[PDB]
């Protein structure tokens, strides 16, 4: 009966070292607004997520809408947060 959880790694322009945070939701249910809340960083950002495209393989996909579902990579989320 354990609560849902997704491991989230994200890179910012400032740091060469990525940040690690956990979101209390199942991958597939996690939305951009969930991700933004975990990051909790004000400013004008773009958000790219590591994803598997069926034609091109590993890609970075951008997500715009707050209610939009975040793609995962090997059951986790790997993200780039760019100012």
Numbering used by the authors: 355 to 437
Provide the publication's sentences verbatim.
Three proteins, Dvl, Ccd1, and Axin, play an important role in β-catenin-mediated transcription through formation of a transient molecular complex which is translocated to the plasma membrane in the canonical Wnt pathway. Furthermore, Dvl, Ccd1, and Axin can directly interact with each other through their DIX domains which form the same head-to-tail structures. The mCcd1 and zCcd1 DIX domains have a ubiquitin-like fold with five β-strands and one short α-helix. DIX domains of mCcd1 and zCcd1 are arranged into head-to-tail helical filaments by parallel β-bridge interactions.
In contrast, the zCcd DIX domain is assembled into single-helical filament-like structures consisting of six or seven molecules per turn with a pitch of ~80 Å. The mCcd1 DIX domain was mainly eluted as a monomer with a molecular mass of 10 kDa, whereas the zCcd1 DIX domain was eluted as a dimer with an apparent molecular mass of 19.0 kDa with its monomer included as a minor state in the elution peak. Consistent with this, the accessible surface area in the homomeric head-to-tail interface of the zCcd1 dimer is 590.7 Å2. In addition, the interface of the zCcd1 dimer has two water-mediated hydrogen bonds. In Site 2 of zCcd1, Glu436 (strand β5) in the head-binding molecule have two characteristic electrostatic interactions with Arg368 and Arg395; however, no interaction is observed at the same position in the mCcd1 dimer. Moreover, the side chain of His402 (strand β3) in the head-binding molecule forms hydrogen bonds with Tyr364 via two water molecules. These results suggest that unique interactions observed in zCcd1 may contribute to stabilization of the single-helical polymer. On the other hand, Site 2 interface in zCcd1 was stabilized by two electrostatic interactions of Glu436 with Arg368 and Arg395 in the single-helical filament, despite residue conservation in loop β1-β2 of mCcd1. Phe397 of mCcd1, which is close to the contact surface with loop β1-β2, is replaced with Tyr365 in zCcd1, thereby changing the molecular surface from hydrophobic in mCcd1 to negatively charged in zCcd1. The substitution of Tyr365 with Phe in zCcd1 DIX decreased the apparent molecular weight of the mutant compared to the wild type molecule, making it comparable with that of mCcd1 DIX.
